[PDB]
């Protein structure tokens, strides 16, 4: 009688859909979700789409399967891999597309097919984003989905600038407040204190490393929520996600960390600015060019120091990923400028300011400046120049802790 | 009027060779080296082989054009040459092999197996020739060092002839690369082992902790900085009788001393108390804690089990496991003659529940992992521990 995608959506049982999706992809378990829609107008076409349970494989990047949408015209099969029928970041969708009107045999000149496809393209991506917007309403079944295709969503953020807002509403992250849960961007905004003009994120490799890192200290004490961006995609994602609902994004690993001045803590921070600037310009010289600037931390509580990164430059996470990639492709590392922030109110920083402003030539002072700098790189997610150099330096500091002999 | 490979070699100008290799591979510069040979016997066939100057970017198993009685057949010939020689370009003109076969007539594979084994011999002949001019072999090993080490891994029958062609940086060779036969000439007749280290840069392995008592003892250590080496040594057991030992692995055998081992034995039992304590302070963070016989300036180091993943291995594999996202044995050696070990034995045997002792054992263990090429559990945890130790260096 009629093919399965011509019967209309609410007249089909979810198991009938599944038997079809199994027969279409040989997947051993049924579909996860289904969107099934038709279109009339200048163009008549139907479309049945499936989202597999287990995220498909990355396919050699061969790009030899831009998609797996079986393509029909007037109920006859045509192609299996239709390059411009679906944007690359939705290639996991399985299903069929049955057009009534598109032109098949075409030369270069007949761009009309490429118009019909572009409109079907936008209509297919629209009905998908609709389905994901639908899925986001049941919080704990959307979990089975974002678990598999989070990497896919973030890719769209980078490529499809036209749908960037609708896509960003679908992102979920770990934050400081959501101790064990993932939360939307709209939720983080509902918990913002007014006059906070920024959304705080940190990029590392594990939650425990970014949660207990040095960079977030005076931000968690300040009652602020910070977003944990742990997957390597995130480093590229934020590069094109400028703002959400008006508020701009800021990295807690970068210099110039803006915070709300209350009862002009800038006046106390300014006294610290000038009080320790002596110590600032000394360690800049003890280190020479291993660092670019030495400034007073406005973000450090329990740790004495941290290594922050240039504003318009690579980060510790990026520097790790890129150079972990340059192992794979045999290459010189080629051509990341760091800033070191010191906590004025820490005893090690206070006591160091005394020994240094008394005798800045003391080889013990030089040794301690280098040592704190090296451990700060460890805190900030970097790799050391020469590990045994730091090792011998720690051994010397241990010699000082107990009997020097 | 006659094809170029059937013409007798030494009647061939190197420009004719180069012009031909250009016409065969469109390479803009001439060949690097050429081996050209014929064979008679049960099988008659000729072969002209080229080594390109620039190492190519390697599913085309090789580019050896294959002729029979001077007629072309195919170029991608899978079982004509082992995979680690895919950079060879050239032609092979057989007189007798059978092309059309029923799967039963594997006799087609015998003729190929014979040409295969015969081709690899004439190549290793060429490479042994190249090893004689030191600073031109460098132009080659610079490009194909990776290839030779792969052959060590795969071709066990030619494993010996290949190792003779390996070149490395060592402690003695400050800037030059040296053969294995040379390292044997500098061995003491009481030395039964060849010492190597696996790292990432020459500068890091030369100043490493594992080699301390080896440069003081007048011993030479081989610097393996390329990642292939990690797999190379897994199949490179011995050269010229003397076996290889990794300075990152446990059970470091050394030339037995003038019965001074009794002093190493007194150190063994004297610090064994501290060994039992640090073993428990680090709850399964390490597998065993024993007395070092290899450390001079460093107080402690982390070696790996003989059969386990090397320190190098765990770094590379987990650096690659960023691709899969798949996310996946240690020994702690302490230096007896170091003051920090003596002082720790005293603080431990006086009050072994001192949190300063706990702070010191954990701190020493973590920095030793850094010394040994590992990654830290929680960097901010180690940092807070150092900040605590620095706070102790001066008043709290
Ligand atoms: C119908 C016979 N031939 C020529 C061999 C085909 C078959 C398929 C296609 C697909 C094309 C094409 O549009 N590619 C880009 C997007 N795309 C579609 O819109 C459908 C399939 C597909 O890959 C095309 O331009 O010519 C084609 C020509
Ligand atoms: C021209 C006829 N065609 C190919 C279309 C051939 C040509 C060559 C071969 C070689 C075979 C063969 O002997 N393979 C074993 C070794 N071998 C070669 O000698 C060349 C490639 C290769 O794998 C074969 O099984 O079928 C062939 C079929």
Author numbering:
A (entry chain A): 293 to 627, 630 to 699
B (entry chain B): 293 to 350, 356 to 625, 631 to 698
Recite the paper's sentences:
In this study, we report the crystal structure of human Hsp90α MD and CTD (Hsp90αMC) labeled with a coumarin derivative, MDCC {7-diethylamino-3-[N-(2-maleimidoethyl)carbamoyl]coumarin}, which is covalently linked to Cys374 of Hsp90α. The MDCC–Hsp90αMC structure was determined at 3.5 Å resolution. Unexpectedly, we observed MDCC to only be covalently linked to Cys374 in the MD, although there are six additional cysteines in Hsp90αMC (Cys420, Cys481, Cys529, Cys572, Cys597 and Cys598). The MDCC–Hsp90αMC structure contains three molecules in the asymmetric unit, which further form a hexamer through crystallographic symmetry. Each of the MDCC molecules is located inside a composite hydrophobic pocket at the hexamer interface, contacting Hsp90αMC mainly through hydrophobic interactions. The binding of MDCC induced the ordering of three regions in Hsp90, including the catalytic loop, the Src loop and a CTD loop, which adopt unique conformations and contribute to Hsp90 hexamer association. The structure suggests that MDCC binding locks Hsp90 into an inactive hexamer, with one key residue Arg400 oriented away from the ATP-binding pocket so that the stabilization of the NTD and MD that is required for optimal ATP hydrolysis is not possible.
The 90 kDa heat-shock protein (Hsp90) is an abundant, essential cellular protein family present in all eukaryotes that is the hub of a molecular chaperone machine which utilizes a reaction cycle driven by ATP hydrolysis to stabilize, regulate and activate the function of several hundred important client proteins under both normal and stress conditions. All of the Hsp90 homologues exist as flexible homodimers, with each protomer consisting of three domains: an N-terminal domain (NTD), a middle domain (MD) and a C-terminal domain (CTD). The NTD contains an ATP-binding site, while the MD also participates in ATP hydrolysis by contributing a conserved arginine (Arg400 in human Hsp90α) from the ‘catalytic loop’ to stabilize the γ-phosphate of ATP. The CTD is involved in homodimerization.
